[PDB]
Amino acid sequence: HTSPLLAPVRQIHAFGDSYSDNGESQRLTREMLAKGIAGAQALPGEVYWQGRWSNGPTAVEVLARQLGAQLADHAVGGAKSGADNYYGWMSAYRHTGLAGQVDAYLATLDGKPVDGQALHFIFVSANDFFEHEDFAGEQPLEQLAGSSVANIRAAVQRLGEAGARRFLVVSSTDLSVVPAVVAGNRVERAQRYLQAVNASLPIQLAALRKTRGLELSWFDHLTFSRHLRRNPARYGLVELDAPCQPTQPSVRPACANPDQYYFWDEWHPTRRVHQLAGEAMAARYAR
Numbered sequence: 127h128t129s130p131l132l133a134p135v136r137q138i139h140a141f142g143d144s145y146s147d148n149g150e151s152q153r154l155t156r157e158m159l160a161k162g163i164a165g166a167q168a169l170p171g172e173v174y175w176q177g178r179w180s181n182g183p184t185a186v187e188v189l190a191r192q193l194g195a196q197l198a199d200h201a202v203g204g205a206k207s208g209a210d211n212y213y214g215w216m217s218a219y220r221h222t223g224l225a226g227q228v229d230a231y232l233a234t235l236d237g238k239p240v241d242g243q244a245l246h247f248i249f250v251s252a253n254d255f256f257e258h259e260d261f262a263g264e265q266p267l268e269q270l271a272g273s274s275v276a277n278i279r280a281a282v283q284r285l286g287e288a289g290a291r292r293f294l295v296v297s298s299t300d301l302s303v304v305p306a307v308v309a310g311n312r313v314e315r316a317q318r319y320l321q322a323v324n325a326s327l328p329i330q331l332a333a334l335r336k337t338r339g340l341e342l343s344w345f346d347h348l349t350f351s352r353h354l355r356r357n358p359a360r361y362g363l364v365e366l367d368a369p370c371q372p373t374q375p376s377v378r379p380a381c382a383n384p385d386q387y388y389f390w391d392e393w394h395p396t397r398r399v400h401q402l403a404g405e406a407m408a409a410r411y412a413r
């Protein structure tokens with residue numbers, strides 16, 4: 127039986143990674159190139175739509191449209207759950223991880239308190255895993271998962287202390303079906319990581335609900351994707367595994383029918399899956 131709808135939302139503050147970014151990695155990396163920062167590259171790049179790491183709006187942009195809310199999207203492609211980014215060269219210019227996004231959001235408020243009616247949307251952790259795998263991190267995956275969860279809990283705590291009262295926390299996605307993960311033969315590594323994050327994060331959300339009357343909503347992105355992938359024709363999808371827009375080892379021409387594809391590139395969903403995700407997220411809220 128469904129629960130009561132949550133209250134209407136008119137402002138979203140989003141924090142997170144390339145599954146949310148609607149233009150911040152592009153703005154920041156253009157700034158970094160203009161200032162000659164060492165190692166800087168223009169992100170996301172020329173096979174991506176309007177600064178999104180996809181071919182269309184991300185899930186949180188669709189959530190905002192569905193709810194009739196304005197969106198301040200702080201998320202930055204590459205962001206980890208702590209201070210920094212999968213792209214190490216950014217750290218000398220700006221701390222763009224979740225913790226850095228929170229720092230900057232609170233610093234840009236003038237000592238002014240947070241809007242207690244705004245929805246604080248948090249969606250991060252993938253790059254903690256991608257960085258670990260791609261650069262041979264030595265931490266066991268269960269400890270990495272613990273670190274990601276502690277970082278997320280810390281961000282909620284810091285935002286709540288500053289005055290936030292409404293949150294939407296997104297689970298780990300199904301990293302085990304990400305094309306780069308599959309091509310790297312890292313599926314069971316991804317399963318162990320994502321299951322540890324997703325088991326532990328709801329327990330931390332229970333603890334945080336004990337003060338400030340925090341509304342801490344959980345979006346289980348794994349449940350969402352498993353349902354879509356088990357019933358793809360219902361949603362107009364056909365190709366669940368191959369990227370529409372290959373980039374590795376080099377860029378190839380995009381597929382003709384991108385709304386029938388789950389993945390845009392080797393890491394990111396297409397606009398069609400972001401739409402379905404945003405609609406699923408929005409279903410918990412009144413208009």
Ligand SMILES: [Cl-]
Pocket residue numbers: 174175176177
């Ligand atoms: Cl562009």
